Design a protein around this ligand. Structure first.
Ligand code: H4M
Ligand code: H4M
Ligand code: H4M
Ligand code: H4M
Ligand code: H4M
Ligand code: H4M
Ligand code: NA
Ligand code: NA
Ligand code: NA
Lengths: 282, 282, 282, 282, 282, 282
């Protein structure tokens, strides 16, 4: 059985940018088939409604087992409209968001939606005087490295893979939808890192990434004097750059012990595992 | 007046992952509106055809001024199907691809399509023993950093911005469609870097990135002994990691002179420019 | 005129460890004379009282113009005893402390005491399973670097030097006692860095250092499971190590422009100033 | 029983700055109680005499088991006055010093004093054109890192801990007083590093650090042309900065093997030990 | 049997600069004796002929068992003259060269000569506007690091050592002359590195060094506009600097496992082996 | 007119390895012609005598204007034989050596020989248990980087270029022979570095390199216990590695100001000069 899903991306988060690709990293899965629609970076009410309608139009013929909506702030107006449209729809749905999503966590459960809220997926320093396209991409490169090398992406991969198995068992109840809040302490329940200093450097990285959000928010929404806000948002980027260097450092530690966890998919969708570089994944 | 475009993403490249977002980095442009559809990482003929149909269905009501198709190897069968459907449609279309696209360069011009072929946008080490989702993300982070900090993304940004201005003049002829091949030497025609050592480090980073392709191709398509191919594809990732560090080091040299070029958009879509950290973009 | 002061150190903060030495960096000032007493790291009520008594006994003959008490948490019982004794004494006094001192800020003004509260002077990961003396010193080396290279110690140096000048004018009123809260944003009112990226790297370093406190507090005072709390306090130390790296990077940027601010004392106490390596301070 | 000691600090050395704190790193020992007194950075004959008298005055009621004098150059006139008063007093005494203390080593033994001379504890570049308070703190930060991560502070900690045990057996003869000269070669007699490269990197860092003294002495006491002496003292600081990195690199090696030695104190003053991050100290 | 050889150096390559020294690293071999002659950097026909004549004149009395000619491009005119003179001589001869030597590989075997062609031994950016003596030496230092720490110099050491043993067996047939082409993949057949990431980092270093050649060749022999060729050849040097860092990072990995391969000579010429730092080589 | 010289190399020093090549970096000088002879690493009396005889034999027909002998310790037996033979010959001669040559400095002037003694050209840790050919080459790469990037090679380049101009004026008196001792302080008389921190970093590097010699000597000639000498000589190599990193960091500083000094030769042997990357040397 081939599981089917539609991903909807409005605005951009590290996680929502990579979510579908984490699930079929070499395109050889024969057990999944995805459609991705979005309105690029725009996430106001009209755009989000238009994106969700695309999904729903496509769903009629595609018949997806579930739908995923990914982007910043589930509590904002645009994403709120999406939650509402998807809740009222026939399809099980999952919301991917960031720390601000916590404000509507209870609401989402009441709505019958799953969620994955990624606290370290921090808003960037979105002031015109600082953030051009190249800076926006550099920040995203640092963030992606943080979310990957600390193991956060593995947590997201797992959550969807478990859900895809349920989709293949043919009934997805609300009880099956993920309800995850991911942060620095998430790593304490996992066996991601063989070396405990690699773990605590990855924790520091997630801590700093999460702390980036408050700096950005202060610079974008609170401080009004550009003489103050430009430096403030630029300092949030210098942070994320260092979180990435910490995440890098953790990974090299795992390399030094020939212990880098890799969990690739087999063509039948099964998730394999290995540590040693020369060891076949199984 | 508002330019409209649909982006189609099948498979993944650093440039195709970011192309739409480079054009509206804070989501405040009032002069553009985009739709994005894709079949995620899958880019065989059926998936590509299904992706392009999504785009065309949506186009009926959306009425885009142009359509972009982005992903690996324009010469491959899936991307070949797309070029033909788009070349045969009523919509001006642009192909975003990598070095292997060079094989059908003349074909694409004959087809009446524009293209942007990014040679440093190198295929990764796609063998299951090595590439799991986290590794695929890590690679993508390094590559994004290279394409951003060396200024390749600015060349991309500029080509689409020029096209969007034409879309607003209301006629896009074949003469308007971009026809770009980007590589290490592209920097020599630009004024990206104020410091000439930042420039040559950035050139070294693009040269190493472009060299990664051959190593990945040897490891995925030529070498058949996994005792040899796993180290080979892994060494391609170590290369892209050091390319990213070179790009970083270049950008830090522009910092040391307070000379980082930023070219953000204004709400009306105009591209602004500045160098000094405290100077308003204009 | 020779100004005199007594410094009392109970417990240890980066700032209280260096406070007196920042005022006479080559021991050639002829206009100051200091005495320094303390009970080492112990800062419970009996020790703090004993420390302040030494100070007051010595003060009888020494006749200091002002007395400074420095160490962790002005709101804690030990430090609260010292504030009380110092407020009730005849000598103007200044409290050096960390973020937790903010809880008794209004109290201190009401007590007629000056203060300097250094938010980035963060508590370390004080769990026996992690913190031995070597780890404790490593943390203090990283923190000293942060507080020095970001310019925080320069803010402290100025505050006392202004006070010392008042002491020489012979009357210190409450109006003269410093009332400072130092943190990341402190750098925004200063001209410490010629290079604006050195400034924002230094702001990032201060932000991470202030963020370290919360991680330490969670690991020492909230989390009770040592399988959780050891990694937690260790991740706080990894953060401070990276903050030190940022502060270092900022300072190397100033070096690259031969713009490193130095403000040494002349023998008569006057504070000189220079930027260029070869330029005499004046 | 509770061992009591008074520390006297005149001038500054990395070792004298940290000596007392290395003995009670979390302030939970119930077996010791300390007083600290000093005249800050000033160490001429009259300051030192005043410092020592402070200690003697307090000692009448405090009744310490031993007194420690710490600061630069035991052979200098002020330190020499300290040795005279301490040698003549009733209290066992230890002298904490640097390499210049070697000139009065035999004298010290003849005086009945113990000593710990730390050759890597190098004089900084005390010229007004270069050394302001910030630069003095920066140096102290790199020095502290060197003395901590190479192990040197652990040799100190151990020596005082042994002495403290003899203080508790209630008689301290001259035979118990430490007589240590510490340098690069000290590591060869120890088991500080599990990894042999961490050791040799640590050795190199102590060698560079000891070499710093000669460059500082040349720049401060021999070269008289400021066009020569400013760059000379500045180069001594760049040395110490790289020594600090060597020491960091050594400790990261220990991390990679999960083999970082920690020897914390228990509440009763016993010195515990461990190597594995998760292992309880014992 | 003491084996005798003459080395001829015309032009410079990393390998030819170090070839003889790799065979007697502490000068304590009693089983070899060498003469070295050359014309420094000049390698045109006249100079090469003069160099080979020196060698042959000396050979009359010296009676070497074999002769080595080392330097750039065995296919160039100067080196072609040497191959002809050596082939026609009575002495077994080996040619050390770089990738361009591949054009005359078959020719050399037909000539009855041995060869070792080192692909990563890349031509530098020889344009007067960029390459002064200091730059030439810096590039050589990076290249030497690469060739050493990746294990390429060990391969060269072995080939000669095997030949030297044959020379002592008293007959060197053409069958004994080395016929090696060394590149990135050479590492796959060896057991140089205990850690597999050290290996792949070394492979990446060798790939980059090999890629340097093409960039230098483009900038020296193809591009004619100095506004383009100066940055081009400077970018080749930035590449080689990063290859050296990768090689360094590989070796530090081996240190982290106490597994650095060392194969020194014994006085009797026997090649010893060890991994652990404290283990006698055997 | 074309100046001619013979270089004799016995043993190895960073300077002697590069001395001839620093004089014709692209091989395009038409005003010089060189022969190079040596006995490789061996420098005992018989070998040195045999090397000097080769030179003198060749000199009969070559008619060199001067002869250079380069290698370790001009005071050792081998090199003493060379000095005597060269002093007694008809050819003006120059001795290239290291610090130990200082012992026979006066003797060399009495002998009528010139010299260049390079104190930072430090002996490596030549113990069999540590130094194999790869380690030997790694040390030489680090030292070469130090001697090049700090500007020491430029000093040597100048000295020979001045002598070469005299050789073309046709008479070389003893008054023309260089008599140089190079060390850290040599940089103070030069204008090598535009940035003063690059200068003091290069000084630090030369100080560390020069300090390496003492560590090597202790480990090779003094310490007899291999448990002590192996770590000792390996620590000298860690020092040289850090000295190379300081030299690198100095050069990157020069890059950040577009101020790297380049002094290439024109075809007629004239020494050109430039600082800006794009500026023609003149
Ligand atoms: C494309 C980007 N990619 C990402 N990628 C990741 N991973 N995470 C992200 O957060 C983002 N971004 C988050 N994004 C994001 C977040 C917040 C805001 C809101 C703005 O931060 C507020 O609206 C500021 O107030 C704008 O300030 C505005 O006002 C200032 C003065 O102008 P004036 O001259 O008009 O007065 C200017 O700086 C201007 O930008 C915009 C974009 C981007 C859409 C989006
Ligand atoms: C999602 C990834 N993101 C990217 N992102 C960027 N920026 N750039 C990229 O190139 C990619 N990837 C390119 N991708 C990509 C590219 C080429 C191949 C072709 C494969 O390399 C060939 O199919 C291999 O031959 C498969 O190898 C297979 O053969 C081995 C033996 O197993 P057996 O059990 O079959 O025997 C295993 O390694 C398995 O991996 C696959 C995926 C991914 C779809 C995609
Ligand atoms: C000497 C240090 N140097 C510094 N230097 C600087 N710059 N800044 C600092 O904050 C410090 N330190 C702050 N310091 C500091 C701060 C808080 C605590 C309190 C502790 O964090 C809590 O009281 C923990 O609960 C103790 O943990 C205790 O409980 C655990 C289980 O044992 P159980 O088995 O008895 O149950 C063990 O980890 C044990 O340590 C101690 C020391 C040090 C006194 C002091
Ligand atoms: C507070 C510092 N912290 C440390 N911390 C550690 N860990 N280690 C140390 O060595 C120190 N320092 C060692 N200390 C220290 C050591 C020696 C000198 C002696 C000075 O080096 C000589 O007395 C100079 O000659 C002064 O030079 C003087 O002469 C120059 C010309 O001016 P002009 O206008 O008078 O002619 C000026 O540069 C001036 O400083 C000073 C301070 C500092 C007190 C002290
Ligand atoms: C000394 C170096 N050491 C090495 N060491 C190693 N390890 N590897 C190497 O390749 C070398 N080098 C390679 N070598 C090498 C290689 C090629 C060329 C040929 C040059 O690349 C071309 O001949 C340029 O065309 C010269 O261009 C000339 O033209 C421009 C002025 O034009 P115009 O304005 O005069 O007309 C200037 O750039 C000038 O250099 C020279 C030397 C060096 C001799 C040699
Ligand atoms: C090849 C190297 N390249 C360089 N390159 C540069 N730039 N600079 C240099 O100085 C050198 N080296 C200096 N050279 C050099 C210098 C001194 C010694 C003297 C040796 O350091 C002593 O001869 C040791 O005492 C030997 O130790 C011997 O004893 C131990 C075994 O015990 P046993 O049981 O054999 O008795 C072994 O370590 C063995 O090597 C050797 C070589 C090398 C030939 C040469
Ligand atoms: Na603006
Ligand atoms: Na003094
Ligand atoms: Na350069």
């Amino acid at each position: 059985t081939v599981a089917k899903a539609i991903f909807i991306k409005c605005g951009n988060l590290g996680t929502s940018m990579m979510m579908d690709m984490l699930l079929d990293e070499r395109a050889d899965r024969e057990d999944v088939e995805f459609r991705v629609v979005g309105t690029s970076v725009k996430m106001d009410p009209e755009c989000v409604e238009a994106a969700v309608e695309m999904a729903l139009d496509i769903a009629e013929d595609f018949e997806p087992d579930f739908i995923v909506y990914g982007g910043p702030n589930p509590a904002a107006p645009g994403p709120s409209k999406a939650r509402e449209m998807l809740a009222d729809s026939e399809y099980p749905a999952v919301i991917i968001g960031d720390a601000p999503g916590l404000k509507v966590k209870d609401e989402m459960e009441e709505q019958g939606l799953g969620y994955i809220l990624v606290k370290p997926d921090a808003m960037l320093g979105a002031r015109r005087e600082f953030l051009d396209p190249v800076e926006m991409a550099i920040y995203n490169a640092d963030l992606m490295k943080v979310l990957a090398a600390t193991g956060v992406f593995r947590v997201v991969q797992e959550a969807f893979d478990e859900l895809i198995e349920k989709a293949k068992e043919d009934e997805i109840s609300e009880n099956d939808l993920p309800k995850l809040v991911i942060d620095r302490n998430t790593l304490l329940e996992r066996e991601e890192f063989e070396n405990p200093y690699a773990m605590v450097k990855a924790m520091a990285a997630l801590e700093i990434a999460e702390n980036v959000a408050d700096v950005s928010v202060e610079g974008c929404f609170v401080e009004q004097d550009k003489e103050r806000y430009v430096p403030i948002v630029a300092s949030a980027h210098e942070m994320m750059r260092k979180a990435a260097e910490l995440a890098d450092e953790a990974r090299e530690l795992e390399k030094s012990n020939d212990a880098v966890l890799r969990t690739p998919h087999a063509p039948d969708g099964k998730v394999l595992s290995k540590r040693k570089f020369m060891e076949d994944p199984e």
